[PDB]
């Protein structure tokens, strides 16, 4: 007999094709997509709880650290730490999905932009994406002069929220 252990279910009618109908079935794909999403975070979320080995401290260092004053520690509340871990987890999700693609935005009206950045129609990748519009025929006859009320200004540089109040308050020149 045969079964798929992501779904945990046995196949009802065993043939080769019923397997392939289950192997590329919508239900089964959503399981195996979700199964590896759980094993991804679990290696990171279950952080290596290391084992400590405490040495018997010296007579010398015990006197040199006694004269040194005891520093204050900061412990947050349970309600506080449940929110701050909700934030810091959601922040690391953002740094995954940045993908800084300003450079594609800069060469928009150039003479080979269809052939290099559209990426349905390169050579290296182009045959593979057609399986799984802005065509390759585009030349520099259409849109001769870019600035004819068409172009958008460059989106300004991003900044950190936490340190949003380090910015100089006034601009040097008067913008419109």
């Amino acid at each position: 007999r045969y079964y798929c252990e992501y779904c945990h279910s046995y196949l009802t009618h065993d043939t080769l094709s019923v397997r392939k109908s289950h192997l590329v079935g919508k239900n089964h794909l959503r399981i195996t997509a979700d199964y590896y999403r759980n094993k991804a975070r679990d290696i990171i979320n279950k952080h290596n709880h290391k084992r400590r080995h405490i040495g018997k401290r010296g007579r010398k260092e015990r006197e040199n650290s006694s004269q040194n004053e005891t520093l204050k520690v900061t412990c947050l509340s349970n309600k506080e730490k449940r929110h701050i871990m909700h934030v810091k987890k959601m922040n690391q999700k953002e740094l995954a999905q940045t993908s800084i693609d300003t450079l594609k935005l800069l060469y928009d009206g150039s003479p080979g932009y269809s052939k290099v950045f559209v990426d349905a129609n390169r050579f290296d990748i182009g045959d593979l994406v057609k399986a799984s519009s802005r065509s390759r025929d585009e030349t520099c006859e259409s849109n001769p002069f870019p600035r004819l009320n068409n172009p958008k200004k460059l989106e300004p540089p991003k900044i950190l929220s936490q340190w949003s109040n380090t910015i100089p308050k006034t601009s040097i020149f008067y913008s419109v």
């Binding site: 934030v87 900044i159 950190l160 006034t170 008067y174």
Partner: peptide, 26 residues
């Protein structure tokens, strides 16, 4: 997951005097 990492910077204007007009020629 309410707030975000980054914002575009907002900034105050310098009130438009003769010394800080970017179109000025004279």
């Amino acid at each position: 997951n309410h707030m975000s990492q980054f914002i575009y910077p907002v900034q105050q204007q310098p009130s438009l005097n003769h010394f800080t007009d970017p179109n000025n020629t004279t």
